[PDB]
Structure 1
Amino acid sequence: QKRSEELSRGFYELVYPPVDMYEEGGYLVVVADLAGFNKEKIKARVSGQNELIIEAEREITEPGVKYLTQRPKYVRKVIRLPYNVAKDAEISGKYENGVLTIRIPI
């Protein structure tokens, strides 16, 4: 009546962060739940040409005795964009309440 193992940091690093991608107004908008990071270690870029890849890293200490460890240390989210844009442009963003909002001109 107990599972074999619990999801680990590795599992979440594989699938983190959850992202919504839609079109609203002028822009293509990307929204990511990315709690517990510092603004300076969050990165975004178009690569290969078609993709928006989001990257972030943080240190997580493992104090005292541990029972669960799931929170991702490193994040690498490859988002296949449906349209094209160069590899610069005005990709503007905000990071608030752990939510990363990326707006791309289009």
Structure 2
Amino acid sequence: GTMMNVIMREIGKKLDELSREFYESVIPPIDMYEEGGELVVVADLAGFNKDKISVRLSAQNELIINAEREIQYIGTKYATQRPLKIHKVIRLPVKVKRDSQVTDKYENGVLTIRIPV
């Protein structure tokens, strides 16, 4: 549910055995700043397909990042921490114009989003 519950779930773990469920809550970390008249969001979101990443602006001034991937490995599996599904809701600091041109770029695993304000 909450972050606290997510994080407390991992409380007795070593740092190399954190659950997938935890990374599905915590990924992606996000940088946010405003420069040149637009609001810029930057996400570390490695190893997804561009057609499998969705970005959304809510009525509620929330930025929603969605991503999905499938991962199947041949052989003996020892750790499967990399997240399959991502759902990141970001409340926006400053109001964004309803009609706007929004730019995004996905490179080197990094998702950069530019929203005019």
Residue identity opposite 1:57 in structure 2:
E
Residue identity opposite 2:69 in structure 1:
R
TM-score after normalising by structure 1: 0.89
- Alignment of 1:37 with 2:42, yes or no, is no
How many pairs does the alignment contain? Answer: 104
Q: 1:50/1:68 Cα in 2 relative to 1: closer, same or farther (>3 Å)?
A: same
Where structure 2 has 5 or more consecutive residues not aligned to the other structure, the ranges are 1-11
- Alignment of 1:56 with 2:97, yes or no, is no
In 1, the alpha carbon distance for the partners of 2:68 and 2:29 equals 16
- 1:78 counterpart residue number: 89
RMSD across aligned positions (CA): 1.6
Greater percentage in helix? 2
In 2, the alpha carbon distance for the partners of 1:56 and 1:16 equals 11
Where structure 1 has 5 or more consecutive residues not aligned to the other structure, the ranges are none
- 2:6 counterpart residue number: none
**Could you tell me whether the CA contact under 8 Å between 1:21 and 1:29 is conserved in 2?**
yes
- 2:26 counterpart residue number: 15
TM-score after normalising by structure 2: 0.81
**Could you tell me whether the CA contact under 8 Å between 1:58 and 1:73 is conserved in 2?**
yes
Bigger relative CO (Cα 8 Å, ≥ 6 apart): 1
2:32 aligns to what SS in structure 1?
A: strand
